[PDB]
Design a protein around this ligand. Sequence first.
Ligand code: PRO
Ligand code: PRO
Ligand SMILES: [Mn+2]
Ligand SMILES: [Mn+2]
Ligand SMILES: [Mn+2]
Ligand SMILES: [Mn+2]
Ligand SMILES: [O-]
Ligand SMILES: [O-]
Lengths: 484, 478
Amino acid sequence: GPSFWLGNETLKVPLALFALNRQRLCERLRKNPAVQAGSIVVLQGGEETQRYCTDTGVLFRQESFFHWAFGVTEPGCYGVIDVDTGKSTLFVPRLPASHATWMGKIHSKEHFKEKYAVDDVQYVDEIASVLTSQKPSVLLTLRGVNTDSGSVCREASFDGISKFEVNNTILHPEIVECRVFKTDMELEVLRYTNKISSEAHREVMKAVKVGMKEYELESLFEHYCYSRGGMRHSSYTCICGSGENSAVLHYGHAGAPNDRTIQNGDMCLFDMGGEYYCFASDITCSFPANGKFTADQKAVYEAVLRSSRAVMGAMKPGVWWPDMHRLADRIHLEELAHMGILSGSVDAMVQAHLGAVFMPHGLGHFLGIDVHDVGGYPEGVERIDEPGLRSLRTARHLQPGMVLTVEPGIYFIDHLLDEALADPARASFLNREVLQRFRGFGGVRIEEDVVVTDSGIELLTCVPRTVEEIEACMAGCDKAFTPF
Amino acid sequence: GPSFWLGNETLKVPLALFALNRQRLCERLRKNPAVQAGSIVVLQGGEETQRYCTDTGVLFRQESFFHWAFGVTEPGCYGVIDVDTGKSTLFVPRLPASHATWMGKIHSKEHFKEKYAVDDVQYVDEIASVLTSQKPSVLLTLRGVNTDSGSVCREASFDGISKFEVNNTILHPEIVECRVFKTDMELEVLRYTNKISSEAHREVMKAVKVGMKEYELESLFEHYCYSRGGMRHSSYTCICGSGENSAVLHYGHAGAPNDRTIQNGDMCLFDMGGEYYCFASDITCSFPANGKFTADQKAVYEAVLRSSRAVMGAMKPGVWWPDMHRLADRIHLEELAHMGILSGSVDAMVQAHLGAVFMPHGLGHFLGIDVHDVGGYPEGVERIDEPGLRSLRTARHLQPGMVLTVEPGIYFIDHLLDEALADPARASFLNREVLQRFRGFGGVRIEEDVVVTDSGIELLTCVPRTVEEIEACMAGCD
Ligand code: PRO
Ligand code: PRO
Ligand SMILES: [Mn+2]
Ligand SMILES: [Mn+2]
Ligand SMILES: [Mn+2]
Ligand SMILES: [Mn+2]
Ligand SMILES: [O-]
Ligand SMILES: [O-]
């Protein structure tokens, strides 16, 4: 069959991946007692957008559910699936003659059918007529809440949909559940996005020099990912925090745009991941800017390496993800005590939620078409209202096929530390005279992408992780990647 | 005064630039008979967005009018200007404590006042109170039609605005007209964006090899612009057309994403331009993939070079831009006839609009904070309803301070050629025996950015342009 490919050494992705997703969705829907025979899934693809009121086009990236189901890269499409038969129909825009001048070849419907391996292709202006002819019982559309953004996913609509009976509640939980569990074909793509992003992280580590701006490494990373990986998009805005900025969790946005000069003695925390064909990667490397860990940097870093490997070693089906977050907390606290930053009973530290002072975010999250992937809090799975844990993007138990980030970290965040020092229940554990030395340290995060297997996990990421490995990698002299 | 700067060798842009823009806008409004005392300009900045319903953040780029007035890079702001005094007030978001954890330091109002060199800073939720206290006669908000997109620019709004007198018709044509005329400080930034983008184009020319994918050069260009120029954004999606794709004017979009392998014998047409602090550049370089012009490639290229230089040599204040388009048309037609592609009277070809078959787009456009900049068709300026000319993005007369692209091109576009061959009014001009050789040629576009000056123009762009220069640079000449 056909495959998506950007040539050179980039991954060929079979369009059968999407056909399998459509089949898996129908199979789930058929088992749902509420789903009527003759139902049709109706999805609306993303449309082209501009900057505000200007004609400056924004580069189009497909809506994630529509991509999962069809893998279609063109804007302005719709896609439907007959639940009972699994038959797929793609609706494509009927384009004007001038498109041939400005945008490119005007492809036939047959071209798209062959390209996307769907059962039928029609024009978007015919969708109402085509669906009517099929005499469906009900149209199943997509509406639900994303539990990371809190945004409501908006329903497909088209001229004349009012004449149909529409259900917008059944589909969202079902398609979300399918996305939670990755097929072998999806895993091949995620192995690839991790491979390229890992290589790019290595190139960045080799290239970092004191005196560079953070954004120079962001630029290099994205260039590696695009030119070598065919990754036109990143999975998210590159987080390139040096020095105190490594304590800022989602540093790098427009308000704090990776514009600090890297200084001797800084820790770097680089959280970056390319996207290939709308599949994510999400990797964080932490390392000394000057290629040599200080004693303090080694201690903090190896604390996070310990919780990372402890969690990965414990992960397997049936394990409760919040228990892993708590494991990481307990390990961080043990290590910070060994360093002399903390004193006292670690049991008591845990009871006082002291772990969340140093790791205020969740241990990790589902990953897939979206970097913060869907399905972390389905109905019946509650958010835990405690420091740290309340930021977890899922409270589910692990099952095979789930893809998760494992990203413990330790940070020195002034407002959290100040809060803890003011609280007598936590202050007693903190040794101010030692902690003071770590103000402005920043932080360390070690982020791997893994897949749950029948017996444990498979690690997708491949970057240097021990202190020795990192120092060796940064001292490497290969002019493997030297632009101009 | 403070300046915007991304370190290293990047340009320091004084915030005085935006102060001058506010002053110029007030001075223009004070002369407008529709404007009364006590008026306040109210603008609303862009907000953060995500991909669809996900929490995947889209990199924030400021709305262009707001940038022009304030130079503010943060999302969620408003900005007001007292017309009579020129006093500026920036309104910034009142952030949650957790912002300290996830997004970075919670800067004080005073930090922002110092950063942006405005007269006052307040929190956004206080805008109704602050404006109420100033007892304005009327709020002047921004609403109008962009004549390139057709989209309506939407008005500032805030909770409680309905208690104010609001006018949304006066401001738009005035602030557009200010944007049309670049200050010397703005020209400094456009010289810089052209400098970096020119350097990046030269790196691309040096790096291109047969067998590469087009997107590899897109990647390299953007990497040069960001790492060396501090240009995090491009002004528009890179158009990297090789071979037949060079005949596709806005090739490179999601539907045709620069994924062709460059072949020996191809012409490359690379239209790319970095953006610095929301100021554009827009440059096109055309060159042979293999670094050696064939006779046919040299002929088409030098035809476009001739019209580029004829137009640049003719541009001066008072010149009507549509006349420049027609000049380019005539030159292309003359040269296409000198090549044996066309025969007959060039006067007759022009009368038949034959030029538009080969250049179906406009000669060039205003450029500024937007690559297709505002103000091309103010009230009274009409779009000329003829092939080619109707695609012009302005029909104005040139005046000092305007910044324009000069981008003639010649393309071999099958459905336009075939139309002409079916049209008795045009078909006889075409020599199929020669034209057949150029089917699949693609096209050549030579795009320069220029400033209209008192005496003519200032050329901003600096890339190799002659055949000799191009072949030299592609063989790595310093
Ligand atoms: O937002 C999250 O869940 C992770 C933790 C910090 C970086 N990204
Ligand atoms: O859209 C325009 O005005 C020019 C013509 C082709 C490239 N951009
Ligand atoms: Mn990450
Ligand atoms: Mn993550
Ligand atoms: Mn251009
Ligand atoms: Mn242009
Ligand atoms: O992350
Ligand atoms: O252009």
